[PDB]
Design a protein around this ligand. Sequence first.
Ligand SMILES: CCCCCCCCCCC(=O)OC[C@H](COP(=O)(O)OC[C@H](O)COP(=O)(O)OC[C@@H](COC(=O)CC)OC(=O)CCC)OC(=O)CCCCCCCC
Ligand SMILES: CCCCCCCCCCCCCCCCCC(=O)OC[C@H](COP(=O)(O)OCCN)OC(=O)CCCCCCCCCCCCC
Ligand code: HEM
Ligand code: HEM
Ligand SMILES: COc1c(O)c(C)c(C/C=C(\C)CC/C=C(\C)CC/C=C(/C)CC/C=C(/C)CC/C=C(\C)CCC=C(C)C)c(O)c1OC
Ligand SMILES: CCCCCCCCCCCCCCC(=O)OCCCOP(=O)(O)OC[C@@H](O)COP(=O)(O)OCCCOC(C)=O
Ligand SMILES: CCCCCCCCCCCCCCC(=O)O[C@H](COC(=O)CCCCCCCCCCCC)COP(=O)(O)O
Ligand SMILES: CCCCCCCCCCCCCCCCCC(=O)O[C@H](COC(=O)CCCCCC)COP(=O)(O)OCCN
Ligand SMILES: CCCCCCCCCCCCCC(=O)O[C@H](COC(=O)CCCCCCCCCCC)COP(=O)(O)O
Lengths: 431, 62, 110, 126, 126, 110, 44, 54
Amino acid sequence: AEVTQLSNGIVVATEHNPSAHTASVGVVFGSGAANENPYNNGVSNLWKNIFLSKENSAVAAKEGLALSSNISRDFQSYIVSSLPGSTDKSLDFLNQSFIQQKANLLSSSNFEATKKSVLKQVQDFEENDHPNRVLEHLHSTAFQNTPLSLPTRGTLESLENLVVADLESFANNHFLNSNAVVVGTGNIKHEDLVNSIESKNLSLQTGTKPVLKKKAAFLGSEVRLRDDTLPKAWISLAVEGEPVNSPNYFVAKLAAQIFGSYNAFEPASRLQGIKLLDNIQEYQLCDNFNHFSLSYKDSGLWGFSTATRNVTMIDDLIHFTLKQWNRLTISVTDTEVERAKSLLKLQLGQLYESGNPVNDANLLGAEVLIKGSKLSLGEAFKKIDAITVKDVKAWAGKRLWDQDIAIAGTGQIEGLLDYMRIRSDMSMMRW
Amino acid sequence: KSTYRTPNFDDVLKENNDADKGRSYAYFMVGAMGLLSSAGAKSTVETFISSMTATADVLAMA
Amino acid sequence: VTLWNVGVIIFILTIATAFLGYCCVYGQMSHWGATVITNLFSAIPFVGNDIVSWLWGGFSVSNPTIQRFFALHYLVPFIIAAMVIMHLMALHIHGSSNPLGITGNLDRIP
Amino acid sequence: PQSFTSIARIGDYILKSPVLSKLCVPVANQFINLAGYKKLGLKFDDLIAEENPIMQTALRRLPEDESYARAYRIIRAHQTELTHHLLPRNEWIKAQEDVPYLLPYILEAEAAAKEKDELDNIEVSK
Amino acid sequence: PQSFTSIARIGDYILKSPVLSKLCVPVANQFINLAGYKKLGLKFDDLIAEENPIMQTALRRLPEDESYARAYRIIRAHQTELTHHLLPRNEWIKAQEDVPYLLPYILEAEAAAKEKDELDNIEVSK
Amino acid sequence: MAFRKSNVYLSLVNSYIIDSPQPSSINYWWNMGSLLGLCLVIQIVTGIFMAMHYSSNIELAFSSVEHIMRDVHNGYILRYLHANGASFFFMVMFMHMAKGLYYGSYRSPR
Amino acid sequence: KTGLHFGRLSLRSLTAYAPNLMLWGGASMLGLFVFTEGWPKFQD
Amino acid sequence: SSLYKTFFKRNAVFVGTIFAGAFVFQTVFDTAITSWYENHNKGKLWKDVKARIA
Ligand SMILES: CCCCCCCCCCC(=O)OC[C@H](COP(=O)(O)OC[C@H](O)COP(=O)(O)OC[C@@H](COC(=O)CC)OC(=O)CCC)OC(=O)CCCCCCCC
Ligand SMILES: CCCCCCCCCCCCCCCCCC(=O)OC[C@H](COP(=O)(O)OCCN)OC(=O)CCCCCCCCCCCCC
Ligand code: HEM
Ligand code: HEM
Ligand SMILES: COc1c(O)c(C)c(C/C=C(\C)CC/C=C(\C)CC/C=C(/C)CC/C=C(/C)CC/C=C(\C)CCC=C(C)C)c(O)c1OC
Ligand SMILES: CCCCCCCCCCCCCCC(=O)OCCCOP(=O)(O)OC[C@@H](O)COP(=O)(O)OCCCOC(C)=O
Ligand SMILES: CCCCCCCCCCCCCCC(=O)O[C@H](COC(=O)CCCCCCCCCCCC)COP(=O)(O)O
Ligand SMILES: CCCCCCCCCCCCCCCCCC(=O)O[C@H](COC(=O)CCCCCC)COP(=O)(O)OCCN
Ligand SMILES: CCCCCCCCCCCCCC(=O)O[C@H](COC(=O)CCCCCCCCCCC)COP(=O)(O)O
C-alpha cells in the first residue's frame, strides 16, 4: 500500500494492488473549469464527450477496453480500463486516438451530434436536479467575478456558440506534458508501465500554460431563485473554508463531521449522537441535511445543504442550526470530538479503499499534481488523532464567529428571512 | 440570460472587504449609542425619584 | 403554574391598595398605622434611613405623605386590572380544572 | 413529581419484607376504602394526571379495547358527581378488578427516557 | 365605489360623440403623463385596488403568463420607490403597451353579480 | 420552536414588534404612530409625579402650581415638559391624520 | 460513566459558563455604578 | 486587528464596558460643562460680586 513516482519529463504514478482483477491507465491534466473564461465555458465538458462518443468507444470495445472521464474545477481525466494482461493495448489506444491523432474525433458530423446531446444533458439538469443546481449557484455568488465561480457543466448560453476552433485552441494551451500526470491503478506494476512508456516516446506537448490574472476571493452575498410551483424548498449556506495544502485541512473536516448528515425517513439515522436533532424532530422542520467541507487550490467552503416540505418554519431551521455552530467557539465537549475522530476515519477510509480502480486514478492524479506526492492513509490517521478541543475552538473563533456568509435557495422560500437576520445569528450575544 | 451570472455590484463594494475593519466602524457607533442612552436613562430616572424628596418649605422648618 | 404566579402578584398589589386608602381618611388609626409600617424600612443595612425619608417626604408622617398616598391609591387599581387580563389569557390555554382531578375533554358544556 | 420507578422501588422493598408488610399493608387497604374512588366507578390508574409526555406516550401504546372502556368510566363518573349521588352498589369496582393496567406502559417509557438522557451527558475515557 | 360598468357607459358616450372627444381627450392624455405611473414601470390596471370579491374573481380567471409578469412589475416598482429614484427611460411603459388587459374579466364578473342579484328580489306576476 | 413564539406573553410581543411583516416601501410618515405612544407615556408619568404635590381646592390651586415651580426639586422640569408635551402630542396627531387622508388609509378594508 | 445533569443545567453546563457568569456577575457591578451614583451611595 | 475578541466579541464585558463608561463619562462631562459656563459668565456671578463688595 504505497505509491511510487518517477520523472522523465513525464510524471508516472502508480498504486499497485496484486489482489485485483482489473487495471486502469490514464492521463490527468491540471486544468479544470477554473481555467477557462465566461465565453468558452463548457469546452472541457465537450472534450469529455468527444472522448466517449460512439466510434471511439466502438474501436475500444472490439479490443476489450472500457472508457471513462471526469471534469472538475481543478483537473480533468481520460481513463482506459482493461484486464490485467492487456495494459500495453490500453496505452496504445490512449496514444493513437487521443494525444497524437484527433482529426478523426473533431469531424463535422461527430461534433454536431455531440453538441446536441450535451445541450440536452444541461437543459435537463437545470429543470429537474434541484439540490445540485443550488450548490452550483452557491459557488457563483460566493466567488463572483473570479475563476472559481464558473459551472463545470457549462451554461446553456455559452455552450451554444462553441465551434471546433474553441476546442483546438483549448487543447494547445492546456494539454501539455508540463501539466500532465500518467497514472496506473489495480494489478499493474510500476516497472512494466515505465518500460512500456520508454519503448514508445509518449509526449503530448511541451508546456507553458497560461497564468490566471485573478485570484479567488470570497464575498458574502445571496441569490434567490423563487418557484412557487415546486413542492419543497432547497437551501445551502456556507462560509469561507480551507484550501488544499493548508495546516487546518483535517480540523475543518472533523468539525463538519460533528454535525453530520440526516435522513428523516431512515430509523437509525434518527438515533445519531447529534444535539441538533433534539430540536428538529419535535416539529420535523426538514427531510434531510448534510454538512460539507470543500477544498480547492485557492480557497474553500464550509457549510450545509437541506431540503424540506415544512415551508412555514424555515426560520426555525436556520436559527437552530446556526446556534449549534456557535458552540464550536464556546462549549464543544470532548465526547463530541472523540466521536467525530473515528467516524471521519471510517469516511475517508471508504473513499480511498473502494474496489474501483477508476476512482483510485482520479484521486491519485489530482493529489500528485498539487503536492508532488501522495500522503498515505496511515499518516492521515495520525494527524486526526492528535487534534484537541483547543484546536477546534481556535479554528472556529477565526473562521465562523461573526463572519460573512453566502446563501442560495430555490423553491418555496417565502419563509426565508433577509440577509442581516441570518448574519446576526453567527454570534450569540450571550458571550 | 443565465441565473449563474451575478449582476453588477461595483458601485457599492469596498477597498478589500477586510473583515478586521468592516466590523470595527459599525460596532464603535453601536457602542457609543448604547453608552449615551444608558447615561441618559440614568439621569431621567434620578430626576423623577428626587422629586419625591422633601420640599424647600419642609427643609426650612427642619 | 403561570396562572398561579400572576395571581400571587394581584394579591400583593391589593394589600398595598387598601393600606394606602385607609391612610387617606387620616384618623387616629390612620396616622399610627402608617408610622409603624413605614419605620420598618429604617432597619435595612446602611440604606434604610434614606428610604423612610423619601417615602415620607420629610421627617415624619406629615402633609407630603398623605398627598402622595392618595395619588398612588388611585393608580394601583388600574394596574390590578391589567394583571387580571393577563391572568385570563393564561386560563384560556388549558381551560379550567374540575373537582375530580382528571381530564375534562370527554364531556364539555358551553 | 415523584417517579413511578421510585414508587415501585420503595413499595417492593416494603412488600418483600415480612415484618413491614404485616405492619403497613392494612393501613394501605383502609386508605383505599376511605378514599372512595371505586364508589364512582373508577380504577386507580384512571386518576393519574395525564398532562405530561411520559403519560401521553403510555396512553397511545394502550390497546383499543382497554382504551374505549377507560373513556366510558370517566364520563360515567363526571355525570355521577354533578348529580351529587353515588352509583348503585352493584356497579362499584371490586378489589380484584382494580388492577394496574397502565403501569407497565409507564415504567417502559420512563426507563427509555433515563437511558436517552444519560447518553446525552456522558463522560468519556481515553 | 363607482362601477366599471358606469365608467364605461360614460366614457363610451364621450368617445362616440365627435365634439366631446375633441374637447375631453387631450385633457385626459396629459392627466396620464402628469400622474407618472409609467415612470415606475406600471400599467393602469396594476393600480386598481384588489381587496373586493369582484376583483379577486377577475385575477383568478387571468392567464398564467400575464399573471407572472404583473407580479414582477409590482415588485420592481416597490424597490424603485424605497430608493427614491426613477427607472431608466428605456424601461418606461410606452403608450401602446398600456392596454386594459383586465377590464374584460371585470365587466364579465360584474354583469353576473347583477343578474344573480335581480333574480333574488323578483316581483312575480300572476 | 423558539421561546419568543411559544410563550403566551412574548408571542404577542413577537407578532407585533419583532416578526411583523411590513411593506418594503413605507416612508418616514409611517413613524408618527410610534411617537404618539411615547407622548402618552411622557404625559402619564410626568402627571403622576406632579399629582403628589397638587391641591384641587379653588382657594389652593394656583398656589400649588407655583409651589411645584419654586419648592419642588426639578419641578420646573416636570411642568414645562408636561405643558409643552401636550402641544407636541397634538401636532404629531394632526400629521398622522393628514397622512391617512392623503394615502387613503380610511378605505376598506380599514 | 455519566455526569449527573439536574435536568437542563448539567455539571459541564455550569463549568463552560462559570467564567461567563463571573463576567455577567461583573456586568451588573458595572450597571450598579451607573444605577445609583447621583444620590449618595458609595461602594466598598 | 485582534480588537475583536477583547473589544467587540465579549458581550459580557461590552454591556459591562457600556455601563462602566457611562458612569465615568457623566462625572467628567459634568465638570467640563460647569467650568465652561461659569467662565463664560465671569463678573456676573454672586461669588465674584461678593468679593468686590469687600
Ligand atoms: C415635532 C417634531 C416631531 C419629530 C419628527 C417629525 C418628522 C416629520 C417630518 C415629516 C416626515 O416624516 O416626512 C419627511 C419627508 C421625507 O421622508 P422620506 O422617507 O420620503 O425621505 C427619506 C430621506 O430621503 C432619506 O433619509 P435617510 O434615511 O437616508 O437619512 C436620515 C435623514 C434624517 O431624516 C429624518 O429624520 C426624517 C424625519 O438624515 C438627514 O436628513 C441628514 C441631515 C442631518 O419629507 C417630505 O416629504 C417633505 C418634508 C417637508 C415637510 C415637513 C413639514 C411637516 C410639518
Ligand atoms: C379634525 C381633523 C382635521 C385635521 C386637518 C389636518 C391638518 C394638519 C396639517 C398637517 C400638515 C401635514 C401635511 C402633509 C400630509 C402628510 C402626507 C403627505 O403629504 O404625503 C407626503 C407626500 C409624499 O410624496 P408622494 O406624493 O410622491 O408619495 C410618496 C412617494 N410614493 O408629499 C407631499 O404631499 C408634500 C409633503 C410636504 C408637506 C408640507 C406641506 C405643508 C407645509 C405647511 C403646513 C403647515 C402646518 C402647520
Ligand atoms: C382580582 C382578582 C382575581 C380575579 C378577577 C380572578 C379571576 C379568575 C376567574 C374568572 C377564574 C375562572 C375560573 C374560576 O373562577 O375558578 C379564575 C381562576 C383561577 N384563579 Fe383567579 N382571579 C383573581 C385572583 C386570583 C388569585 C389571588 C389567585 C391565586 C393566588 C388566583 C388563581 C387562580 C387559579 C389557580 C385559577 C384556576 C382554578 C382552576 O381552574 O381550577 N386568582 N380566576
Ligand atoms: C393624554 C394625557 C394628558 C394630557 C394631554 C394632559 C394635558 C394637560 C394640560 C394641557 C394641562 C395644563 C398645562 C398648563 O399648566 O398650562 C395639564 C395640567 C395638569 N395635568 Fe395633565 N394631561 C394628561 C395626563 C395627565 C395625568 C394622567 C395626570 C395625573 C396623574 C395629569 C395631571 C395634571 C396636573 C396635576 C396638572 C396641573 C397643572 C400643571 O401641573 O401644569 N395629567 N394637563
Ligand atoms: C406597527 O407596529 C407597532 C409600532 O410601530 C409601534 C410603534 C408600537 C408601540 C406602541 C404604541 C403605538 C402605543 C401603546 C402604548 C400604551 C398602551 C401606553 C400605556 C401607557 C402608560 C403611561 C403605562 C404607565 C404605567 C405606570 C405604572 C407608570 C406610572 C407611574 C409611576 C411608575 C410612578 C410610581 C413610582 C414610584 C417610585 C412609587 C406597536 O405596539 C406596534 O405594534 C402594532
Ligand atoms: C426588541 C426591540 C423592542 C423595542 C421596542 C420596545 C417596546 C416594548 C413594548 C411593545 C408593546 C407591546 C406589544 C403590543 C401588545 O402585546 O399589545 C398590542 C396588541 C393588542 O393587544 P392584544 O394582546 O392583542 O390584546 C389582548 C388580547 O389578545 C386578550 O384578550 P383578553 O383580555 O384575555 O380577553 C378578556 C376579555 C373578556 O371580555 C370580557 C371582559 O367580558
Ligand atoms: C415599536 C417601536 C419602535 C421604536 C422602538 C425604539 C426602542 C429602542 C430599542 C432598541 C433595541 C435594539 C436591540 C438591541 C440589539 O440588537 O443589540 C444591541 C445593539 O444595539 C445597542 O447596542 C443599543 C443601541 C441603542 C440604545 C437602545 C435604547 C435607545 C433609546 C431608547 C429611547 C426610548 C424609546 C447590542 O450590541 P451588539 O449587538 O453589538 O452586541
Ligand atoms: C395586559 C395588557 C393587555 C395586552 C397583553 C399584555 C402582553 C404584554 C406582556 C409583556 C411581556 C411580559 C414578559 C413575560 C416574561 C415571560 C413569562 C414567563 O416566563 O412565563 C412562564 C413563567 O411566568 C411566571 O411565572 C409569571 C410571569 C409574570 C409576568 C408578569 C409581567 C414560563 O413558563 P412557560 O415556559 O411554560 O411559558 C408559558 C407557555 N405558555
Ligand atoms: C420619559 C421622559 C423622556 C422625555 C425626553 C424629552 C427631552 C427632555 C429631557 C428631560 C429629561 C430630564 C432629565 C435630565 O434633564 O437629564 C439631563 C441629562 O440629559 C440627558 O441625558 C437626556 C436624557 C434623555 C435621553 C433619553 C433617555 C431615554 C428614556 C429613559 C427612560 C428609562 C441632566 O441630568 P443630570 O442630573 O445633569 O445628570
